Amino acid sequence: GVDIDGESDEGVKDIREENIYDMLATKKFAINVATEAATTVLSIDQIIMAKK
Amino acid sequence: LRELDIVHPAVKVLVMATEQQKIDMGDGTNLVMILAGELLNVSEKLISMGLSAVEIIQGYNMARKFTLKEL
Amino acid sequence: EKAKQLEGIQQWPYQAVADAMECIPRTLIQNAGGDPIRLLSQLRAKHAQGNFTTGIDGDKGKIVDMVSYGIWEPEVIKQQSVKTAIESACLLLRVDDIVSGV
Amino acid sequence: AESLRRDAALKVNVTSAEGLQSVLETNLGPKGTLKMLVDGAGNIKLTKDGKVLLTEMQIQSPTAVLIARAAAAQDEITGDGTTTVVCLVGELLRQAHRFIQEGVHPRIITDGFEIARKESMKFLDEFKISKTNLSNDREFLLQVARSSLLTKVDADLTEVLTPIVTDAVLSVYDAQADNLDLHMVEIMQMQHLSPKDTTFIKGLVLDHGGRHPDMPTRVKNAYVLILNVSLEYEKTEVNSGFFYSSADQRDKLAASERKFVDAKLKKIIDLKNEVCGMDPDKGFVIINQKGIDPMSLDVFAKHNILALRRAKRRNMERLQLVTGGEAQNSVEDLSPQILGFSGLVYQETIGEEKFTYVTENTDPKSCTILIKGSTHYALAQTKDAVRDGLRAVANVLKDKNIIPGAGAFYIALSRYLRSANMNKLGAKGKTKTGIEAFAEALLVIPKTLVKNSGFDPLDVLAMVEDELDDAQDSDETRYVGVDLNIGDSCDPTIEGIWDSYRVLRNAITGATGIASNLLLCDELLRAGR
């Protein structure tokens, strides 16, 4: 994976040492929400506003 | 995001999508907002290149189904 | 395809060079009236299947073969176009400051 | 004292129309763009409906005022084509404004439209296709339902709402002459679950259900009985309470509150012993519009009787049609024939609210469309797509005629009207100049659909004309239409893109009178102050 280092290291390290894992329910749900979020912004070519 | 004043209404779309992550799963709110902001940056080159935003949306729908099967 | 097997820091600018090589035929597409988005993606896909000699016609404006229809160019022009453009592009990036004086 | 005249209006009216045209130009079609409109309410709403766009924005320009009234008349009659008419009025002014510098008088421009409108009705009757009233058309209704859905969504939700919208009209509407009522179809809005998980509700759902931990999760073949009496303790009109200082005074004071409760409750539990006592796989459900006391919560748990409280008055009137049981005001007069019939009844478990499913009925004669969404704007967009889909299918059962979409009607009509007047030459020599402007104004719709997708509008136009030329030589009938996905032409009968006859019939006549009145104003009149 990606290592933050902070002391020293050469290259990267294995994630299985620290056992840092992400649940499938969290990762799979975050992709569909982020996809629909960017879909809404790209679909809007015009914005109408009014002063309060 | 609840303690910040939002001016542009387009930002509220990402704020409403951020609350979707906190209410149901409660984890990964940073993964939703940061990834959604990068999808607009990589699309900025496609919108400028002349690729219509319609096929850009259609491309993400086909790429989303390919990602869910690999998970 | 070759840049993916190197796996180094130089891999990223190779994609910028490959995109720059595609702008020369794409510029002719913009002058031919055809869609620069559609004709560029369809032409690039034909190189992975067909030969590398399939170019773009100025008279027609659709993807056609250069050899069968009698369109040819010498290699020396291609050798002098790539070498002199890269050598000149490097010299422009070597100057980080503009000195004013006699 | 000079006779010099001015324009000062038509040039501004067309310019103001071109500005409003470009707003709804990219909003038309399934490949169009979805725009966000928020005025003063802080409520994000995204919809492509042309009528909703004009009602949510205050436009000072007088040109858009008449266009706003045109969308209101099409919704109250046709119920669709709000954006298409706006695109036809704006483009027609562009072709007519070019002839103004030539000297063409606007009256002949308006008179040339009425001649082309009457000639369009002749081609309209030959081009339309009659559809049978038979109930085997559900397969054909799937293609018609997708035409309205693909426009207002991203096309991923269409496959989910395809069986829901199709089965919504066919279930509530029996097949006869009769008529159809869209008000009988309930609409429920929930912001909890995602829109991808939405489902169709055959019965009726209610808001406030009974809350007890021992209530059964699923009850199959349950009897529905309307109960108008109060099962909860009542107090005097003036605030008062019963306070007992001893155990003997407990049953004395509390008996006054449960006197009316025990009289009705003891008669209800006797019905369970006489009716549905032995019979397995059956149930008994009490409506009880009023509240429930904590005393009856333990009685209903031992008998597994589903309890309900705080019921909507309007929903109970429709329960008599779905279930069949009449409202019982007094248990003393209750008869065994009052008990209705219902199917599997199971309540979803959610902390904020709870649902009740009366669904799976023999003759429900009603439907409920449950709208789900994660955000607020997702609920407003989905509600707009459902209401537009029901009104589009509504004209399919009423009117037996159907027309193909995807520009198949506009390209064929624009080409027919151009070659009809040249052969006949029965109108006028000067009038055909303005008639050509009407024929060229009908080709903007197929050019608009390909414009949002990035395709060349001139390329797709020449490909359709090449296919129509081969169809004129042969004596057969072949329809040609624009395919947005591939980019070439397509057969609209195979693709399944169809548009209502009533919507397109009032679209040509409606856009004719609206665009004509804008050309009749020579000078803007400012007065009243």
PDB file of C-alpha atoms in Angstrom, chain A residues 29 32 36-37 39-40 43-52, chain D residues 22-23 33-40 42 46 57 154 196 377:
ATOM      1  CA  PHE A  29     -21.250   2.666  -0.933  1.00  0.00           C
ATOM      2  CA  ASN A  32     -21.842   5.115  -5.925  1.00  0.00           C
ATOM      3  CA  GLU A  36     -23.758  10.440  -8.621  1.00  0.00           C
ATOM      4  CA  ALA A  37     -22.310  13.574  -6.997  1.00  0.00           C
ATOM      5  CA  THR A  39     -22.786  13.310 -12.353  1.00  0.00           C
ATOM      6  CA  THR A  40     -25.065  16.070 -11.048  1.00  0.00           C
ATOM      7  CA  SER A  43     -24.994  17.648 -16.000  1.00  0.00           C
ATOM      8  CA  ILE A  44     -25.629  21.278 -14.964  1.00  0.00           C
ATOM      9  CA  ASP A  45     -24.524  23.673 -17.713  1.00  0.00           C
ATOM     10  CA  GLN A  46     -26.401  26.692 -16.314  1.00  0.00           C
ATOM     11  CA  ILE A  47     -27.128  28.071 -12.839  1.00  0.00           C
ATOM     12  CA  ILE A  48     -29.853  30.636 -12.106  1.00  0.00           C
ATOM     13  CA  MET A  49     -29.640  32.580  -8.842  1.00  0.00           C
ATOM     14  CA  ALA A  50     -31.526  35.446  -7.217  1.00  0.00           C
ATOM     15  CA  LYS A  51     -30.541  37.904  -4.504  1.00  0.00           C
ATOM     16  CA  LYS A  52     -32.326  37.666  -1.157  1.00  0.00           C
TER      17      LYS A  52
ATOM     18  CA  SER D  22     -31.190  28.340 -25.680  1.00  0.00           C
ATOM     19  CA  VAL D  23     -32.239  27.744 -22.061  1.00  0.00           C
ATOM     20  CA  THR D  33     -28.788  18.623 -19.892  1.00  0.00           C
ATOM     21  CA  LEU D  34     -30.312  18.870 -16.414  1.00  0.00           C
ATOM     22  CA  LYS D  35     -30.270  22.385 -14.947  1.00  0.00           C
ATOM     23  CA  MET D  36     -30.620  23.496 -11.326  1.00  0.00           C
ATOM     24  CA  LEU D  37     -33.083  26.262 -10.414  1.00  0.00           C
ATOM     25  CA  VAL D  38     -33.253  27.679  -6.878  1.00  0.00           C
ATOM     26  CA  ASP D  39     -35.104  30.957  -6.274  1.00  0.00           C
ATOM     27  CA  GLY D  40     -35.174  32.204  -2.692  1.00  0.00           C
ATOM     28  CA  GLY D  42     -32.764  27.342  -0.563  1.00  0.00           C
ATOM     29  CA  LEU D  46     -33.424  19.772 -10.904  1.00  0.00           C
ATOM     30  CA  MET D  57     -37.981  32.073 -12.562  1.00  0.00           C
ATOM     31  CA  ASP D 154     -29.916   9.656 -16.441  1.00  0.00           C
ATOM     32  CA  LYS D 196     -32.512   2.413  -6.863  1.00  0.00           C
ATOM     33  CA  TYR D 377     -33.463  17.071  -5.325  1.00  0.00           C
TER      34      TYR D 377
END
